[PDB]
Design an enzyme around this catalytic site. Sequence first.
Site, PDB file in Angstrom:
ATOM      1  NE  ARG A  71      76.505 114.938 100.795  1.00 43.12           N
ATOM      2  CZ  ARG A  71      77.591 115.679 100.554  1.00 43.12           C
ATOM      3  NH1 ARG A  71      77.525 117.000 100.542  1.00 43.12           N
ATOM      4  NH2 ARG A  71      78.760 115.088 100.346  1.00 43.12           N
ATOM      5  CD  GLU A 127      92.633 109.323 103.253  1.00 41.53           C
ATOM      6  OE1 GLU A 127      92.634 108.142 102.870  1.00 41.53           O
ATOM      7  OE2 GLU A 127      91.662 110.110 103.141  1.00 41.53           O
ATOM      8  CD1 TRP A 135      91.902 113.965 103.418  1.00 46.32           C
ATOM      9  CD2 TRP A 135      89.878 114.702 104.035  1.00 46.32           C
ATOM     10  NE1 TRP A 135      91.164 112.877 103.819  1.00 46.32           N
ATOM     11  CE2 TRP A 135      89.918 113.298 104.194  1.00 46.32           C
ATOM     12  CE3 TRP A 135      88.699 115.388 104.358  1.00 46.32           C
ATOM     13  CZ2 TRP A 135      88.827 112.568 104.668  1.00 46.32           C
ATOM     14  CZ3 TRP A 135      87.632 114.666 104.846  1.00 46.32           C
ATOM     15  CH2 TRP A 135      87.690 113.275 104.975  1.00 46.32           C
ATOM     16  CE1 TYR A 164      86.740 107.296 107.893  1.00 48.63           C
ATOM     17  CE2 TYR A 164      87.194 109.387 106.814  1.00 48.63           C
ATOM     18  CZ  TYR A 164      86.437 108.228 106.923  1.00 48.63           C
ATOM     19  OH  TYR A 164      85.423 107.999 106.048  1.00 48.63           O
ATOM     20  CB  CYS A 195      82.661 107.483 102.771  1.00 46.92           C
ATOM     21  SG  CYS A 195      81.996 109.067 102.222  1.00 46.92           S
ATOM     22  NE  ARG A 222      78.582 108.150 105.540  1.00 48.14           N
ATOM     23  CZ  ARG A 222      78.464 108.969 104.495  1.00 48.14           C
ATOM     24  NH1 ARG A 222      77.471 108.818 103.625  1.00 48.14           N
ATOM     25  NH2 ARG A 222      79.312 109.976 104.360  1.00 48.14           N
ATOM     26  CB  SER A 223      78.395 106.895 100.947  1.00 47.39           C
ATOM     27  OG  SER A 223      78.212 107.659  99.783  1.00 47.39           O
ATOM     28  CG  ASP A 250      83.134 108.310  94.227  1.00 51.89           C
ATOM     29  OD1 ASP A 250      83.477 108.404  95.431  1.00 51.89           O
ATOM     30  OD2 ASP A 250      83.900 108.484  93.234  1.00 51.89           O
ATOM     31  CG  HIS A 310      76.997 106.770  94.570  1.00 52.78           C
ATOM     32  ND1 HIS A 310      77.129 106.413  95.902  1.00 52.78           N
ATOM     33  CD2 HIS A 310      77.771 107.861  94.389  1.00 52.78           C
ATOM     34  CE1 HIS A 310      77.934 107.270  96.499  1.00 52.78           C
ATOM     35  NE2 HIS A 310      78.325 108.185  95.598  1.00 52.78           N
ATOM     36  CB  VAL A 311      78.192 105.374  88.436  1.00 53.77           C
ATOM     37  CG1 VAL A 311      78.936 106.119  87.328  1.00 53.77           C
ATOM     38  CG2 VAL A 311      78.745 103.972  88.651  1.00 53.77           C
ATOM     39  CE1 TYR A 312      79.819 110.989  93.297  1.00 48.67           C
ATOM     40  CE2 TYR A 312      77.987 112.484  92.945  1.00 48.67           C
ATOM     41  CZ  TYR A 312      78.881 111.869  93.802  1.00 48.67           C
ATOM     42  OH  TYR A 312      78.852 112.156  95.137  1.00 48.67           O
TER      43      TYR A 312
HETATM   44  O1  LIG Z   1      86.508 107.969 101.288  1.00 46.66           O
HETATM   45  C1  LIG Z   1      85.572 108.406 100.623  1.00 46.66           C
HETATM   46  C2  LIG Z   1      85.002 109.715 100.753  1.00 46.66           C
HETATM   47  C3  LIG Z   1      83.955 110.054  99.983  1.00 46.66           C
HETATM   48  N1  LIG Z   1      83.391 109.193  99.067  1.00 46.66           N
HETATM   49  C4  LIG Z   1      82.295 109.657  98.185  1.00 46.66           C
HETATM   50  C5  LIG Z   1      80.961 108.932  98.327  1.00 46.66           C
HETATM   51  C6  LIG Z   1      79.977 110.046  97.994  1.00 46.66           C
HETATM   52  O2  LIG Z   1      79.849 110.162  96.579  1.00 46.66           O
HETATM   53  C7  LIG Z   1      80.644 111.267  98.613  1.00 46.66           C
HETATM   54  C8  LIG Z   1      80.290 111.533 100.059  1.00 46.66           C
HETATM   55  O3  LIG Z   1      78.935 112.037 100.121  1.00 46.66           O
HETATM   56  P1  LIG Z   1      77.891 111.469 101.229  1.00 46.66           P
HETATM   57  O4  LIG Z   1      77.790 109.971 100.997  1.00 46.66           O
HETATM   58  O5  LIG Z   1      78.402 111.919 102.577  1.00 46.66           O
HETATM   59  O6  LIG Z   1      76.633 112.176 100.794  1.00 46.66           O
HETATM   60  O7  LIG Z   1      82.061 111.023  98.516  1.00 46.66           O
HETATM   61  C9  LIG Z   1      83.903 107.922  98.870  1.00 46.66           C
HETATM   62  O8  LIG Z   1      83.444 107.139  98.049  1.00 46.66           O
HETATM   63  N2  LIG Z   1      84.962 107.598  99.684  1.00 46.66           N
END
Ligand SMILES: O=c1ccn([C@H]2C[C@H](O)[C@@H](COP(=O)(O)O)O2)c(=O)[nH]1
Length: 285
Positions: free
Chosen positions: A25, A63, A85, A111, A171, A191-192, A194, A232-234
């Site tokens: 995004r 946290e 944060w 949260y 996330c 859901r997401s 890295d 995912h990996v950046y």
């Molecule tokens: O607790 C967390 C918070 C964030 N993210 C990462 C996942 C994504 O790379 C990014 C959040 O972006 P969206 O998935 O909201 O686009 O931060 C995590 O892995 N864990």
Amino acid sequence: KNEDESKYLDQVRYILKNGERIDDRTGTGTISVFGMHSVYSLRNGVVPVLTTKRVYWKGVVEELLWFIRGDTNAKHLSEKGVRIWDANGSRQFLDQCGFSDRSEGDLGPIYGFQWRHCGAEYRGMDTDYTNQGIDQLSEIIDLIKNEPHSRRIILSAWNVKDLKLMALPPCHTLAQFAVRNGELSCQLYQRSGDMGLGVPFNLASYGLLTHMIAHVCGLKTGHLCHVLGDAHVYMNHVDALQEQLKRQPRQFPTVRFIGNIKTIDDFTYESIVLENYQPMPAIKM
Ligand SMILES: O=c1ccn([C@H]2C[C@H](O)[C@@H](COP(=O)(O)O)O2)c(=O)[nH]1
């Protein structure tokens, strides 16, 4: 021996080899696999804190305690030296997200607010919400103690009505708990994630939470199921993770609790003892 961390490294290897190259995004390149799952033993005090790269354990604990307080003020975390944060609470970020009316540090109904006050009207971080909304965290501890076989033990931050007010939609979206064999287990729906920074931090966090709940409920711990949507990996982390993949995992550390911890609200930084955590160095990402 540490087969469970070997599985995380295999997930990273699978993503690098087989993932799709997509811009997210922000327009930042990622390599992504949709739908991944792994299981980590929590038995005998084990917390799945990765050994192939140092996890910010101080950040994980502060946290989690700040979540348990129901706190959404990033400054209260920053004041313990945990700045994870701070960017999302900055005057700049608030104004960019159309929260120009909010005080610096106010992350919205994220949260902590959802865990302790789900459904209450958010009116800012400085408001006292004592006894407002649904205390999900109290409710799931009540279920684990009174109805350990319940199929309805869910802690959810994904409050649809509140998403627009949050600094970031969660996330780590929901966690289900279950008791078998007098052992508390957790399935985390993320859901997401890295794989470089977020996922190891989140695994440590939910491993620790499951131990804290198990402790207060007088239970042993079983396993943590980690379910990923977008794993995912950046692109700008690929070399760092290729480095980590050359490293052999060590045994996970264990956690134990000290003091008279009777309720979820009685844990302090000092009450949480992490044993035998000796990771290889943090990798620059
Ligand atoms: O607790 C967390 C918070 C964030 N993210 C990462 C996942 C994504 O790379 C990014 C959040 O972006 P969206 O998935 O909201 O686009 O931060 C995590 O892995 N864990």
